[PDB]
Enzyme design. Structure first.
Site, PDB file in Angstrom:
ATOM      1  N   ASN A 101       0.961  -1.138   0.039  1.00  0.00           N
ATOM      2  CA  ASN A 101      -0.009   0.108  -0.052  1.00  0.00           C
ATOM      3  C   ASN A 101       0.966   1.104  -0.036  1.00  0.00           C
ATOM      4  OD1 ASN A 101      -1.862   2.069   0.361  1.00  0.00           O
ATOM      5  ND2 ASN A 101      -2.631   0.907   2.276  1.00  0.00           N
ATOM      6  N   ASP A 200      -1.693   2.060  -4.471  1.00  0.00           N
ATOM      7  CA  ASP A 200      -2.132   0.913  -3.655  1.00  0.00           C
ATOM      8  C   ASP A 200      -3.048  -0.084  -4.387  1.00  0.00           C
ATOM      9  OD1 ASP A 200      -2.731  -0.568  -1.235  1.00  0.00           O
ATOM     10  OD2 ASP A 200      -4.309   0.402  -0.770  1.00  0.00           O
ATOM     11  N   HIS A 356     -10.217   0.666  -9.804  1.00  0.00           N
ATOM     12  CA  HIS A 356      -8.897   0.111 -10.408  1.00  0.00           C
ATOM     13  C   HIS A 356      -9.043  -0.874 -11.700  1.00  0.00           C
ATOM     14  CE1 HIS A 356      -5.615   1.515  -7.976  1.00  0.00           C
ATOM     15  NE2 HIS A 356      -6.312   1.354  -6.995  1.00  0.00           N
ATOM     16  N   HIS A 390      -5.481   5.103  -9.737  1.00  0.00           N
ATOM     17  CA  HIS A 390      -5.181   6.433  -9.731  1.00  0.00           C
ATOM     18  C   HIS A 390      -4.315   6.677 -10.968  1.00  0.00           C
ATOM     19  CE1 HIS A 390      -6.827   7.010  -5.821  1.00  0.00           C
ATOM     20  NE2 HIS A 390      -6.173   5.918  -5.264  1.00  0.00           N
ATOM     21  N   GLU A 415       1.670   9.449  -7.641  1.00  0.00           N
ATOM     22  CA  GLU A 415       1.557   9.138  -6.170  1.00  0.00           C
ATOM     23  C   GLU A 415       2.881   8.741  -5.665  1.00  0.00           C
ATOM     24  OE1 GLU A 415      -1.605   6.697  -5.214  1.00  0.00           O
ATOM     25  OE2 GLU A 415      -0.870   6.208  -3.229  1.00  0.00           O
ATOM     26  N   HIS A 417       2.991   8.054  -2.236  1.00  0.00           N
ATOM     27  CA  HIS A 417       2.613   7.910  -0.932  1.00  0.00           C
ATOM     28  C   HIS A 417       3.775   7.711   0.098  1.00  0.00           C
ATOM     29  CE1 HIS A 417      -1.260   6.803   1.486  1.00  0.00           C
ATOM     30  NE2 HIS A 417      -0.277   7.242   2.131  1.00  0.00           N
ATOM     31  N   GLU A 460      -2.406  11.572  -3.284  1.00  0.00           N
ATOM     32  CA  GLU A 460      -1.532  11.062  -2.102  1.00  0.00           C
ATOM     33  C   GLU A 460       0.099  11.445  -2.206  1.00  0.00           C
ATOM     34  OE1 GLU A 460      -2.684   7.164  -1.128  1.00  0.00           O
ATOM     35  OE2 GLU A 460      -3.708   7.830   0.255  1.00  0.00           O
ATOM     36  N   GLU A 536     -12.381   9.953  -1.717  1.00  0.00           N
ATOM     37  CA  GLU A 536     -12.577   8.389  -1.306  1.00  0.00           C
ATOM     38  C   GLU A 536     -13.489   8.698  -0.164  1.00  0.00           C
ATOM     39  OE1 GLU A 536      -8.665   6.346  -0.953  1.00  0.00           O
ATOM     40  OE2 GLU A 536      -8.101   7.183  -2.779  1.00  0.00           O
ATOM     41  N   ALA A 538     -16.090   5.618   2.436  1.00  0.00           N
ATOM     42  CA  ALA A 538     -16.948   4.528   2.761  1.00  0.00           C
ATOM     43  C   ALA A 538     -15.934   3.299   2.228  1.00  0.00           C
ATOM     44  CB  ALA A 538     -18.295   4.659   2.207  1.00  0.00           C
ATOM     45  N   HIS A 539     -14.887   3.110   2.955  1.00  0.00           N
ATOM     46  CA  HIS A 539     -13.815   2.157   2.598  1.00  0.00           C
ATOM     47  C   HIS A 539     -14.611   0.691   2.660  1.00  0.00           C
ATOM     48  CE1 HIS A 539     -10.278  -0.115   3.092  1.00  0.00           C
ATOM     49  NE2 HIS A 539      -9.860   0.631   2.273  1.00  0.00           N
ATOM     50  N   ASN A 596       4.243  -6.739   2.629  1.00  0.00           N
ATOM     51  CA  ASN A 596       3.388  -6.644   1.860  1.00  0.00           C
ATOM     52  C   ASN A 596       2.050  -6.049   2.792  1.00  0.00           C
ATOM     53  OD1 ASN A 596       1.476  -8.886   3.032  1.00  0.00           O
ATOM     54  ND2 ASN A 596       3.458 -10.097   2.614  1.00  0.00           N
ATOM     55  N   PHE A 600      -5.484  -5.675   2.447  1.00  0.00           N
ATOM     56  CA  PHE A 600      -5.861  -4.381   1.977  1.00  0.00           C
ATOM     57  C   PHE A 600      -5.985  -4.133   0.531  1.00  0.00           C
ATOM     58  CE2 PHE A 600      -4.948  -3.328   6.551  1.00  0.00           C
ATOM     59  CZ  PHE A 600      -5.888  -2.348   6.630  1.00  0.00           C
ATOM     60  N   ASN A 603     -11.062  -4.208  -1.588  1.00  0.00           N
ATOM     61  CA  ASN A 603     -11.888  -3.187  -1.026  1.00  0.00           C
ATOM     62  C   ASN A 603     -13.024  -3.209  -1.753  1.00  0.00           C
ATOM     63  OD1 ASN A 603      -8.792  -1.508  -0.676  1.00  0.00           O
ATOM     64  ND2 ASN A 603      -9.646  -2.688   1.092  1.00  0.00           N
ATOM     65  N   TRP A 998      -8.856   1.675   9.337  1.00  0.00           N
ATOM     66  CA  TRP A 998      -7.770   1.687   9.968  1.00  0.00           C
ATOM     67  C   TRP A 998      -7.582   2.640  11.236  1.00  0.00           C
ATOM     68  CZ3 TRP A 998      -8.325   3.165   4.923  1.00  0.00           C
ATOM     69  CH2 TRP A 998      -8.636   4.398   4.720  1.00  0.00           C
TER      70      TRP A 998
END
Ligand SMILES: OC[C@H]1O[C@@H](SCCc2ccccc2)[C@H](O)[C@@H](O)[C@H]1O
Ligand SMILES: OC[C@H]1O[C@@H](SCCc2ccccc2)[C@H](O)[C@@H](O)[C@H]1O
Ligand SMILES: [Mg+2]
Ligand SMILES: [Mg+2]
Ligand SMILES: [Mg+2]
Ligand SMILES: [Mg+2]
Ligand code: NA
Ligand code: NA
Ligand code: NA
Ligand code: NA
Lengths: 1021, 204, 205
Positions: A101, A200, A356, A390, A415, A417, A460, A536, A538-539, A596, A600, A603, A998
């Protein structure tokens, strides 16, 4: 050729130099086909000048670029396999895909990558006809190559490319020969561009999009832009078309732009080259601007995707055609006025989802059939917008979103991140050339698509000065679309829209220097005027989307809250095979990748094979385009469509009394955009029978659309009507249950039925019907659940997150608290046997729970259980308060009167309807890839399973898997069905959360915090 | 302090500066100037270059400087001197009272330019009073206007020193040479000599 | 060293590529002197860690980059003159300075420059004391080179630069040896950067 050799080309090391992002790569442009017939360009027939090179290629894997032999540039290696292109090579077993991620999969030392840089050597042998070589330009188009690549044609070095998600084009006309040609592509896994590609997702590599050859004439259309400009009421539009040529200018060259609505021609214009004067040196001699007037244009929206077909002809003055190009044109205007994002003068409500590009078998290779499958499922579940998370997608995706109607947020492939701090590269001007290429080539590719309404600067990456520069670049070249960007706290100067990630509805999250305010608070901050669209929220990790209705209550109430994009559409699980060739869904860690981020990657609202999670129905109901309000006998139906009348809709209503129907009817809907329609119901039946009366309405689409079948249900709502409480006395049977007390048990028999209560444990240990034992495990209290992904968070065995719910439950000892019998009494009444027990759950001397029960077996064979539970106020609040047992029966169907059909939880039950539901037992289990608590049905008044019947008001789930097995098993394919059937019946159940996965996200009204709890059950046969 | 960007010869003048393929080359010339010179107190204004039209690369580099160095205004003349890439209206050789209505880049008079609808920025002439030879007639009209109007805050005379070079004829006697005297062709003859002082710094 | 040779370095043609404006050039920064004494830094006394290389250099003029011989990377040419650096070579009679206002002095075909691209080959032989090589970083600073240049140190290719009016810095600490060092700079008159440098002035190099 020394300078074409691998020793010379690779010595520069262009993949470790952010100043070099390409060598000899052609300019970015909209997709070309180079039709030489304008009627063929209009009807979008396939061009003979665009030749696909997809198919079987030769492939060799190498651990490093230095390990590739020099002979590969001339002929195929003997060890080369034959792979299909497009593909990722990790999906063919050459090295492992890596899921991570935040942490980079390489050592963070920019711009350097590891010397162990896995290298894929592709080669293709192909024939070019001599007509392509006699005149014109022949280019090769790589629509996507992950991550960086050098290109050779016939042993001669052509060029270099980066930016895996945008097309790379190279002129090959000085390299091709007549007859047989060889094309050698050396693809690297890691490059300097990999520091800007920390999304991610699974990190794969290869030639993962299409490869094609394009033959263009010498004088050619090099670029064309379309722009639509409107009057105040959108009744007159001006299509401004800007066409650029390259090649040698001639005064007989003309450009015709024609606009077509299907078969009829709406507008047309023609012009010689030569633009207007723009400065002191003159104008563009190689450009035209054509302005076409369109009277009453059919406007494009996601509701009604009206498209025109613009055909751009490059031709001479006498009239012979040199080249035709074409694009679909949608008349639409997107602008922000007065703090509201408007489409065609109307404020949007974004019913969005992040998506994605993922396929479980082919990795990141997308075909048309999976794209069409995604778009139909999105529109059938009331989504109208997609965020390209993304990176820019495959070019066919934008065409299909034009056609079916979805708003698209197109996002640059930036990105970082993993950087510390997150803007280390994006505040560095040495990385501004690499970042600008990723933004400017996206805009140049995709600016003509009507479905793209918002540009995104990436995801990010902190907030650096490179974002502000690239923000202002886009606003200069394309004023017709807003620009959003989240990094740096979601309200920086580089965004037109406040776009927070996972900001909550009512709760602030005051992080230092990037606080996530609540979205209601965020709008009202001093000096803040922009609209807010959650990029983003409501995961949807596993069993999630609790509290999704709180977002959609706030979206409809506040005008400047214009919706958001759910994270995300599809699980990124991959397929592995165990030993028998049986496929199973794999997540991060299952390929040997280390470190790793485990599960996650999953989703999605749908599984990787595009079958729905139960949370998708909750999303469909909260995003529905019709809102309903009941007042007596009258239903008002409010349309939330902005542009279309409800011309394919009828309202079907039903009235039922405890599941059995009493009255029904159908009313056609004729409601204006944003209008209302009062539906007067008839005189509804008033049964004197006991029970709750329920009114259910549905909006049914009678006719098929491009995206839905006939009879598609698009909206629904249920209400309680009048209730008749049951004042009927029970039938006084004359039999009496007989109590027998040994020192081991209490035994109660009545007819063939028999109940046994173990006097040392205090629980009902066995029940008999005739001589069949009905239980495998005693009926015991349960205060835990197999933890969800939202319960776990980012906690693992190495790093404990002490705020996560599973770590608070484990530290308090809820999973290992033992019941201690406090007292047990049995008494015979005048008409019943009364068993009274009391248990305490203690962990290290601290009493966590006290449960006091009462069992009343009467003469009718019914066993009424009343449970009173006291919870210690200092322990963390329990996940559930209920009973469990393992039944000996395995019946095939589960029948219940309650909310359903799909699984629902106390904070995810708005989409469920109260009815009589009947499903097979396999439908009562939701096969989440990471196993957890699942299959709960709330609001249940009656449950039928085999011979048994339970009544009350409870939540239940029923499956072949214990909560202990679901807790200790990492994958769903490792679950084995246990003997018998596990039943959990809960009086009370905690919400599931899902604002994020998280941090603790279960709101306080769904936590079991009352301290004292009471519920009642009736077990019977 | 002015970035090393001028593409005066291009047709049109923004052919390179409106092309994003030239945005990496243009950005280096701006970002490395700011990184070298941002600590000097005498530098009060950044300039994006000279005579490069107005493209989207100027707007991006304008906003880059305003992000990394908010303490200094950014000016840029190209594209008609009042584009979105400048904090200061900075015309070249705009007259005091006479308009010059060129198509798409008009040079208004500086008194008129301040009062155009929606215009609020100060006006500082980045080049005015072209001192070519026997020149600076009407220089007092500028300084009457500079003192009278508050938003006219002066300007920069073109220019300080003649760009003449030294040649030797036959006796070793030095003489001042201008364009054309070195065999260069085509050339612009004496337009290199616009100074208020001669090349050896003696005054005109 | 094949990859250090002129046939390999010049085949890429970095001066006709606007995507390549530098190779291996260090980041821009305010002017440094690296004082190792803070009182010496306060009173602005000259630093012993900043060493000027101005003075007499060897120079050879060539009509094109392809006309430079491969032996120039190792030793001085016999026809090389001794010029003072800093200088423009048109002020020493090697070709002519061009004065043009608006019209480019080359054919307008971006990013391509003429093949007749006048080339100045500079070289300097200099001694580095061993204390600089034992620890730390040694960089070379070219405060301005018109128009583009490749740099060699002891026959090994160091880097490439454009933007004639800003300093170009290159790390030489992996290239210098103790004692005698040679530094070969190949300066081109026209580059892709010349399209961004059309100021109304004498075009020198
Ligand atoms: O694409 C944006 C992403 O944001 C991160 S937040 C970081 C929290 C986290 C960090 C490390 C491991 C797991 C979660 C989410 O975990 C992702 O699911 C997705 O929403
Ligand atoms: O640095 C900006 C320059 O602008 C040009 S305008 C163009 C008019 C012209 C064109 C060709 C030859 C002579 C004059 C001036 O001539 C220069 O003296 C200087 O002010
Ligand atoms: Mg690179
Ligand atoms: Mg991320
Ligand atoms: Mg270059
Ligand atoms: Mg000029
Ligand atoms: Na709203
Ligand atoms: Na994720
Ligand atoms: Na004044
Ligand atoms: Na001049």
């Amino acid at each position: 050729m020394i300078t074409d050799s691998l020793a010379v080309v690779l010595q520069r090391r262009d993949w470790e130099n952010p100043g070099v992002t390409q060598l000899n790569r052609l300019a970015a442009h909209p997709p070309f086909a180079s039709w030489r017939n304008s009627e063929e360009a209009r009807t979008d027939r396939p061009s003979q000048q665009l030749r696909s090179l997809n198919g079987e290629w030769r492939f060799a894997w190498f651990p490093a670029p230095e390990a590739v032999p020099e002979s590969w540039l001339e002929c195929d290696l003997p060890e080369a396999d034959t792979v299909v292109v497009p593909s990722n090579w990790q999906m063919h077993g050459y090295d492992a895909p890596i899921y991570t991620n935040v942490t980079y999969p390489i050592t963070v030392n920019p711009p350097f990558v590891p010397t162990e840089n896995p290298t894929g050597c592709y080669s293709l042998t192909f024939n070019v006809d001599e007509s392509w070589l006699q005149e014109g330009q022949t280019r090769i188009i790589f629509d996507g190559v992950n991550s960086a690549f050098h290109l050779w044609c016939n042993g001669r070095w052509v060029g270099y490319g980066q930016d895996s998600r945008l097309p790379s084009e190279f002129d090959l006309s000085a390299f091709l020969r007549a007859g047989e040609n060889r094309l050698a592509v050396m693809v690297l896994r890691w490059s300097d561009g990999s520091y800007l590609e920390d999304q991610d997702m699974w990190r794969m590599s290869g030639i993962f999009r299409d490869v094609s050859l394009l033959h263009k004439p010498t004088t050619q259309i090099s670029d064309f832009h379309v722009a639509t400009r409107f009057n105040d009421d959108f009744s007159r539009a001006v299509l401004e078309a800007e066409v650029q040529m390259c090649g040698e200018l001639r005064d007989y060259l003309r450009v015709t732009v024609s606009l077509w609505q299907g078969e009829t021609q709406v507008a047309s214009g023609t012009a010689p080259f030569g633009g207007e004067i723009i400065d002191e040196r003159g104008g563009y001699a190689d450009r035209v601007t054509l302005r076409l007037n369109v009277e009453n244009p059919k406007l494009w929206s996601a509701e009604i995707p009206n498209l025109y077909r613009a055909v751009v002809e490059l031709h001479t003055a006498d009239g012979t055609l040199i080249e035709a190009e074409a694009c679909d044109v949608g008349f639409r205007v997107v602008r922000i006025e007065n703090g509201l994002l408007l489409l065609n003068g109307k404020p949007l409500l974004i019913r969005g989802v992040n998506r994605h590009e993922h396929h479980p078998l082919h990795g990141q290779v997308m075909d048309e059939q999976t794209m069409v499958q995604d778009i139909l499922l999105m529109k059938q579940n009331n989504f109208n917008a997609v965020r390209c998370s993304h990176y820019p997608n495959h070019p066919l995706w934008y065409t299909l979103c034009d056609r079916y109607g979805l708003y698209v947020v197109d996002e640059a492939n930036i990105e970082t991140h993993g950087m510390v701090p997150m803007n280390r590269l994006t505040d560095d001007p040495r990385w501004l050339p690499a970042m600008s290429e990723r933004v400017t080539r996206m805009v140049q590719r995709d600016r003509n698509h009507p479905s793209v309404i918002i540009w995104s600067l990436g995801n990010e990456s902190g907030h650096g000065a490179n974002h502000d520069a690239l923000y202002r670049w886009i606003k200069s070249v394309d004023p017709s679309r807003p620009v959003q960007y989240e990094g740096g706290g979601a309200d920086t100067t580089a965004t037109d829209i406040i776009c927070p990630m996972y900001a909550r509805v009512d709760e602030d999250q005051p992080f230092p220097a990037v606080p996530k305010w609540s979205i209601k608070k965020w709008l009202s901050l001093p000096g803040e005027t922009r609209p807010l669209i959650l990029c983003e929220y409501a995961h949807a990790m596993g069993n999630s989307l609790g509290g999704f209705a709180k977002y959609w209550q706030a979206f409809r109430q506040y005008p400047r809250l214009q919706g958001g994009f759910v994270w995300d559409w599809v699980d990124q699980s991959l397929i592995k095979y165990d030993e028998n060739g049986n496929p199973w869904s794999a997540y991060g860690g299952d390929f040997g990748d280390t470190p790793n981020d485990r599960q996650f990657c999953m989703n999605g609202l749908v599984f990787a094979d595009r079958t729905p999670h139960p949370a998708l129905t909750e999303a469909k109901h909260q995003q529905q385009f019709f809102q309903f309000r009941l007042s007596g006998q009258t239903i008002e139906v409010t349309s939330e469509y902005l542009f279309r009348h409800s011309d394919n809709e009828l309202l079907h209503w039903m009235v039922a009394l405890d599941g059995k129907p009493l009255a029904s009817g159908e009313v056609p809907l004729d409601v204006a955009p944003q209008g209302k329609q009062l539906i007067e119901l008839p005189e509804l039946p008033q049964p004197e029978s006991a029970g709750q009366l329920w009114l259910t309405v549905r909006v049914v689409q009678p006719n098929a659309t491009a995206w839905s079948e006939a009879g598609h249900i698009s909206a629904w709502q249920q209400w309680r009507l009048a209730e008749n409480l049951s004042v009927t006395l029970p039938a006084a049977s004359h039999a009496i249950p007989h109590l027998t007390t040994s020192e081991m048990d209490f035994c109660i028999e009545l007819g063939n039925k028999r109940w046994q209560f173990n006097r040392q444990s205090g629980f009902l240990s066995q029940m008999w019907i005739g001589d069949k034992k009905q239980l495998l495990t005693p009926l015991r209290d349960q205060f835990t659940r197999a933890p969800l992904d939202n319960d776990i968070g980012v906690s693992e065995a190495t790093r404990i997150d002490p705020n996560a719910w599973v770590e608070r439950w484990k530290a308090a000892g809820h999973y290992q608290a033992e019941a201690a019998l406090l007292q047990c009494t049995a008494d015979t009444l005048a008409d019943a046997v009364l068993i009274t027990t009391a248990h305490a759950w203690q962990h290290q001397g601290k009493t966590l729970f006290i449960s006091r029960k009462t069992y009343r077996i009467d003469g009718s064979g019914q066993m009424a259980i009343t449970v009173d539970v006291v919870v210690a106020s200092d322990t963390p609040h329990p996940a559930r308060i209920g009973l469990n047992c393992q039944l000996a029966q395995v019946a095939e169907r589960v029948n219940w009167l309650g909310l359903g059909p799909q699984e629902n939880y106390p904070d995810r039950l708005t989409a469920a309807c109260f009815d009589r539901w009947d499903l097979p037992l396999s439908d009562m289990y939701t096969p989440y890839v990471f196993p957890s608590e699942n299959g709960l049905r709330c609001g249940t008044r009656e449950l039928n399973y085999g011979p048994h019947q339970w009544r009350g008001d409870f939540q239940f789930n029923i499956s072949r898997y214990s909560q202990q097995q679901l807790m200790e098993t990492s994958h769903r394919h490792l679950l084995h069905a246990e003997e018998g059937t596990w039943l959990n019946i809960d009086g009370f159940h905690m919400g599931i959360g899902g604002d994020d996965s998280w941090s603790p996200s279960v709101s306080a009204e769904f936590q079991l915090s009352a301290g004292r709890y009471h519920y009642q059950l009736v077990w019977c046969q």
